[PDB]
From a paper:
Here, we report on the identification of a special group of nanobodies from immunized alpaca with potency against diverse VOCs including Omicron subvariants BA.1, BA.2 and BA.4/5, SARS-CoV-1, and major sarbecoviruses. We determined crystal structures of 1-2C7, Nb70, and 3-2A2-4 bound to the recombinant RBDs. In summary, we have demonstrated distinct mechanisms of three nanobodies (1-2C7, Nb70, and 3-2A2-4) in competing with ACE2 thereby in neutralizing SARS-CoV-2.
Seven residues in the 1-2C7 epitope (Y369, N370, S375, T376, F377, K378 and P384) and nine in the Nb70 epitope (Y369, F377, K378, C379, Y380, G381, V382, S383 and P384) were also part of the CR3022 epitope. A total of 17 residues were shared between the two respective epitopes, namely Y369, F374, F377, K378, C379, Y380, G381, V382, S383, R408, A411, P412, G413, Q414, D427, D428, and F429 on the SARS-CoV-2 RBD and Y356, F361, F364, K365, C366, Y367, G368, V369, S370, R395, A398, P399, G400, Q401, D414, D415, and F416 on the SARS-CoV-1 RBD. For instance, D115 formed hydrogen bonds and salt bridges with K378 and Y380 at the Nb70-SARS-CoV-2 interface and with K365, Y367, R395 and Q401 at the Nb70-SARS-CoV-1 interface. Nb70 functions indirectly through inducing premature-S1 shedding and triggering pre-mature formation of proteinase K-resistant core before viral interaction with ACE2 on the target cells.
Residue numbers in the entry:
A (entry chain E): 334 to 526
B (entry chain L): 1 to 214
C (entry chain B): 1 to 127
D (entry chain H): 2 to 131, 139 to 217
């Protein structure tokens, strides 16, 4: 059976980056040709693998993570990056193996008046571990006094909204992102081209 | 990155009036990352507005903001004497950038400077340098031209100016202009003159002295 | 957090050779495409060459074809720019970059599409 | 709640300076914190930013030279400046940054002056009267500031003490003037009291026709 890449790339809705989705791809045939045909990809690059040779490869598993960030943020989806996204929302490991694909999604993901449905975590005490997903909504404590679930001075809701508007500059427009991680265990491979 | 351009450079308005200040962004941005600050002379900035339209905690009611994309506005419903300061807008990309600032000054009836000229003191002349000083006292508006003339040639490149802050009682300015030359240059010429052009003067006024005469 | 340090530059006579090196801190050198740009002061920076993670595919700006050869030793976290038949036109500061292996080769020419950049090393070819 | 900057001072072109900012009421390690500087008569310029998780950013005009850092124990933010240039002359503020909610807390700042000039007291010269005007010319001093009073503080109305101008020599020069009714010219004495703390210079100069 084919690996269900279309289910990930062609989904009508995408996750907010702080709650990024993950699909475990196992026991299937990875036909990365569907990726090859479309020219809509503004970002398509791989680490420790050559994207053109992907149909030649076998892995124990593939993971496929997806979410929406803003264009100026797509560069933080790479090992060793810093920023609100890399630090507090989606972290790749320093020794990542896999690919990063992204495309402009202003048409789907922006609204006249502003899309407020897409969020990122703006406040967090310390950096995410690789592939960590923090969906906490605890009031963030910025001073020494406890917030006790109440917003106020030094007590801020951790998640904030992009104001995605279709007329924003390109670097402020939403982008959809899929990260393909390739997992190689000391075990038989279940995903091949 | 994003360049913030504020308009106008200076806004002249009277207490009790409405003020509208503008902030223009080089690219269309989310209004969620646009803030306004007030700075008074010698003081740290004070945050007034965040999210383009939300008034920071404690900020009086007369302040409000609006706009979207490239055009944002700060409005002061009815000016208080304390509102005449500098305002900055701020936008957040990867990091903060500010506009260049708009100065709110107090509009007032025209007032002509009075003009005085001061020759260099003999004490300074001992030192080998001559400073000639021209004073423009308590005028409005701030725009004023000081032209130095030496034996009737217009002097350019050898004078510096500075201006006081608008006066807290009468709302006028004052200006000091210094022409500097070596004692040897000073003693090659006879007539030192300060010519002042100003809206309050029907034509430019000149004060002068003749070196070594009285 | 990968650090790239270039070395091997200096002053050489027209027609000679020079071998540049760039060492990446860390252990993940072998994931990255490694490229070299060069900038003459008062000119735009320019793509020079790249080599993919496994060393199998490289590219060259046209003016260096047949004169420069880029190579790598993943065991040493070092990428190399061999520069033969040097020309005064090659006088520039040379910068190392590390980035993802790109589906579209043209993207390799774009300085901001990499992930880490070196500080640069000077190359001066005189007559 | 307050932020208090320290460490500002005079520095030769190329020298190094370390600023500090001690906080009360916010936890430095839990916030986006910024250094924002303002050169005299100019706008605000962002300089550097540190995330609570440790990521740091720098304006292009100081990348390579400045280093933002912090001490959790002392609840204090630092800024390390190297290869200082005349253009870095400014007041330096630290501020707590809430991004979406702006920068709500600011310090009053600490002033950094980068200059080759040596600290020198002013010569004070009379501006003698030809309403009348008279004054004092406070010339060739470094560094700012001077204070000027008239008649040991008694004479206050009509006084204008002007902002100093930086001369091409790198020394400052300013004027303080007072207008009086012409009829009072020959009836009171007029003394300007000039004090330059950095050089420990205090000058009383009487101004006569
Ligand atoms: C999504 O649909 C398009 C057809 O419009 C196809 O070319 C593409 O391969 C699909 N995506 C995936 C991941 O299969």
């Amino acid at each position: 059976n084919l690996c269900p890449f279309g289910e990930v790339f062609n989904a009508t809705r995408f996750a907010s980056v702080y709650a990024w989705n993950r699909k475990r791809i196992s026991n299937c045939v990875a036909d990365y040709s569907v990726l090859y045909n479309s020219a809509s990809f503004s970002t398509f690059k791989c680490y420790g693998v050559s994207p053109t040779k992907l149909n030649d490869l076998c892995f124990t598993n593939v993971y496929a993570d997806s979410f929406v960030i803003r264009g100026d943020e797509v560069r933080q989806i790479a090992p060793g990056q810093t920023g609100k996204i890399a630090d507090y929302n989606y972290k790749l490991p320093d020794d990542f193996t896999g690919c990063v694909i992204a495309w402009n999604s202003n048409n789907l993901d922006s609204k006249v008046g502003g899309n407020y449905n897409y969020l990122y975590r703006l406040f967090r005490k310390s950096n995410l571990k690789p592939f960590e997903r923090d969906i906490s909504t605890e009031i963030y404590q910025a001073g020494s006094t406890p917030c006790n679930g109440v917003e106020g001075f030094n007590c801020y809701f951790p998640l904030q909204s992009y104001g995605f508007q279709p007329t924003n500059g390109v670097g402020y427009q939403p982008y959809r992102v899929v990260v393909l991680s390739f997992e190689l265990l000391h075990a038989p491979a279940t995903v091949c081209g | 990155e994003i360049v913030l351009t504020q308009s106008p450079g200076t806004l002249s308005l009277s207490p009790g009036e409405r003020a509208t200040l503008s902030c223009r962004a080089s690219q269309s941005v989310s209004s969620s990352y646009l803030a306004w600050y007030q700075q008074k002379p010698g003081q740290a900035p004070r945050l007034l507005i965040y999210g383009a339209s939300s008034r920071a905690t404690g900020i009086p009611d007369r302040f409000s903001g609006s706009g979207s994309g490239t055009d944002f506005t700060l409005t002061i419903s009815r000016l208080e004497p304390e509102d005449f300061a500098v305002y900055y807008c701020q936008q957040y990309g990867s990091s903060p950038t500010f506009g260049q600032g708009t100065k709110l000054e107090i509009k007032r009836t025209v007032a002509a400077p009075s003009v005085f000229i001061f020759p260099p003191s003999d004490e300074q002349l001992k030192s080998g340098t001559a400073s000639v000083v021209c004073l423009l006292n308590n005028f409005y508006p701030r725009e004023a031209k000081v032209q130095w003339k030496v034996d009737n040639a217009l002097q350019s490149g050898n004078s510096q100016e500075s201006v006081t802050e608008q006066d807290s009682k009468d709302s006028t300015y004052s200006l000091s202009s210094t022409l500097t030359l070596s004692k040897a240059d000073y003693e090659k010429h006879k007539v030192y003159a300060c010519e002042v052009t100003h809206q309050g003067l029907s034509s430019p006024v000149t004060k002068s002295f003749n070196r070594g005469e009285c | 957090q990968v650090q790239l340090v270039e070395s091997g530059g200096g002053l050489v006579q027209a027609g000679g050779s020079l071998r540049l090196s760039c060492v990446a801190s860390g252990r993940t050198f072998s994931r990255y495409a490694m490229g070299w740009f060069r900038q003459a002061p008062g000119k735009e920076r320019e793509f020079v060459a790249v080599i993919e993670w496994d060393g199998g595919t490289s590219y060259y700006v046209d003016s260096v074809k047949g004169r420069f050869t880029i190579s790598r030793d993943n065991a040493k976290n070092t990428v190399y720019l061999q520069m033969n038949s040097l020309k005064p036109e090659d006088t520039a500061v040379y910068y190392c970059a590390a980035g993802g292996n790109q589906y579209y080769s043209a993207t390799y020419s774009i300085w901001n599409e990499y992930d880490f950049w070196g500080q640069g090393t000077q190359v001066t070819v005189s007559s | 709640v307050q932020l208090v900057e320290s460490g500002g001072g005079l520095v030769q072109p190329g020298g190094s300076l370390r600023l500090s900012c001690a906080a009360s009421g916010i936890t430095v390690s839990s916030n986006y914190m910024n250094w924002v500087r303002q050169a005299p008569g100019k706008g605000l310029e962002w300089v550097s930013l540190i995330y609570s998780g440790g990521s740091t950013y720098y304006a292009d005009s100081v990348k390579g030279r400045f280093t933002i850092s912090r001490d959790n124990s002392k609840n204090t933010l630092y800024l390390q400046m190297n290869s200082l240039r005349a253009e870095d002359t400014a007041v330096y503020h630290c501020a707590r940054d809430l991004v979406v909610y702006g920068m709500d807390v600011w310090g009053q700042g600490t002033t950094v002056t980068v200059s080759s000039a040596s600290t020198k007291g002013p010569s004070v010269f009379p501006l003698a009267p030809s309403t009348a005007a008279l004054g004092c010319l406070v010339k060739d001093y470094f560094p700012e500031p001077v204070t000027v009073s008239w008649n040991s503080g008694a004479l206050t109305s009509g006084v204008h003490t002007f902002p100093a101008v930086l001369q091409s020599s790198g020394l400052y020069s300013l004027s303080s003037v007072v207008t009086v009714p012409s009829s009072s010219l020959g009836t009171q004495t007029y003394i300007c009291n000039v004090n330059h703390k950095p050089s420990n210079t205090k000058v009383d100069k009487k101004v006569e026709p």
